[model samples]
Target: MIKELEDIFKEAEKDMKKAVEYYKNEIAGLRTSRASTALVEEIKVEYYGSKVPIKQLGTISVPEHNQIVIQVWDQNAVPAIEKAIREELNLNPTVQGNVIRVTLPPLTEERRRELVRLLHKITEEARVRVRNVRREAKEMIEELEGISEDEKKRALERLQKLTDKYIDEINKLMEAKEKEIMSV
Candidate 1:
């Protein structure tokens, strides 16, 4: 037999935890100060092709402590990446823009407040991701065989409970990080 339920349970358990790990790293990279590729690498830039993250279009590095230096493969792509960062990162620039190499200075109170607002938004979505796993786990249970009706029923119930556990785990981590961001 395929041992289908066991296999599904294993993956579902790991994926929910994976979501937390992702949220944890996400929180880590969103700092009160310093340059984190986590901040701008994910910004989508569009020019003459499908929109993609800035990371896909260039190499990002931190030269100075607060500098996020992006070297794009295509010079023409510069304006697009620059435009995307301006919209999302919402930071003031110098040198009339290097077209890459976005700089981040020290954080201010308004910046910290904006980051907290994003913590609220992103934490909610992280919970949504864990629930997404539970949904994935549930969908598989309905189609399962080699089990009684009660077994299938129990799987779903257990999955929900498991999902709740990790969801709380996720909130606790983000809420703590959220406080720390403003802790400075």
Candidate 2:
């Protein structure tokens, strides 16, 4: 066994794993038929002309299946907050005194299809990242000096196998999440 290949695989695996994890966080933020604070929590808003996430603006809560509420800590910032949702985010928001209430519209069929298309692009990007890592490993394998020609050949084959395995992983987790985006 060309044990030198193991270290290469270890670093590649971490990057590959991170790409898959990033995909999950992205796909989780997508809009669905139901409400999720995850969908809005990271959305950036402006106050004092500086940008900040909604999480910092106030508390975000899902009071109902269709409703999300933001209780602003600074009541004076309410107008800008409402504008951020209504204009910047394209979600209609009602200012209930100092609080901002947003109703998540049910996903239309068109929106679902669009979401699925976006999911595909995201999956491909992740798969592409893993392959690039594999390519870099190949380069690293070629530069190994102590290994015999046959051992180098063996390492390349092993690298191919690991690449195939990691690409499958990009699709494996993608399959379940993509299925959900376009579900009727």
Candidate 3:
């Protein structure tokens, strides 16, 4: 029974550790100085009166790393799609008949500061999630105290170690992403 309970924290720590990696990847998709197709993945468009991800209804190409061009598959949806990208993503696009091009301007120092602040906010949230795993494991150890006090002590110690290791990974990822955000 104690082994099974230990596995719960083990599995959760592994999962939360991966969340930091996933966060790093997802944050790359956020708009920055460089043009990235990932930014458009989150854009929703009214396709045939049904809201769908822009990527699904069109093709996005980067002629220049600093520019993104979106070509809608359905001609009629072009205007609506352009509007969605402009309104939803806060990006202005130049439309030449069917293809819409967005030139991503360089990030100003103030903008970089804002992005750094947002990064810290998200990192704190991820840390809280890791702490929650530790709390749950501590609770489980208490519930199993009837088995043996020594076992509970050992389990709590192991759980605390797992929590710190996962938090360290999260911190490492945050530092790497901060570099990415600050770089040109």
All models: lDDT? 0.68, 0.68, 0.71
Q: Please report how far candidate 2 places residue 103 from its true position, in Å.
A: 2.3
Residue 155's lDDT within candidate 2 is 62
Candidate 2 CA-lDDT value: 0.68
Looking at model 3, report the run of 10 residues with the lowest lDDT sum: 25-34
Predicted candidate 2 versus true structure: per-residue lDDT over 61-165, tens digit per residue: 788756778778886457666776554346777777678777856767776766677777888787778778878777776767844476457666766776776
Tell me the tens digit of each residue's lDDT in model 3 across 69-174: 8888778668787887777457788988778889866767877787678777778877777777777766666667455466566766677777777678777867
Off by over 4 Å in 1: 1-34, 94-99, 117-157, 168-184
Task: Kindly provide the TM-score of model 1 when superposed on the true structure, using C-alpha atoms.
Answer: 0.53
Question: What is the alpha-carbon lDDT of model 1 when measured against the actual structure?
Answer: 0.68
Give the deviation of candidate 1 from the true structure as CA RMSD: 6.2
> Clashing pairs in model 3?
none
Cα lDDT of model 1 by residue, 50-159, tens digit: 78776566677777756776666776567777777667566754323343666776667887777787777778888788777878877777666534466566667668
| Runs off by more than 4 Å, candidate 3 | 1-33, 146-169
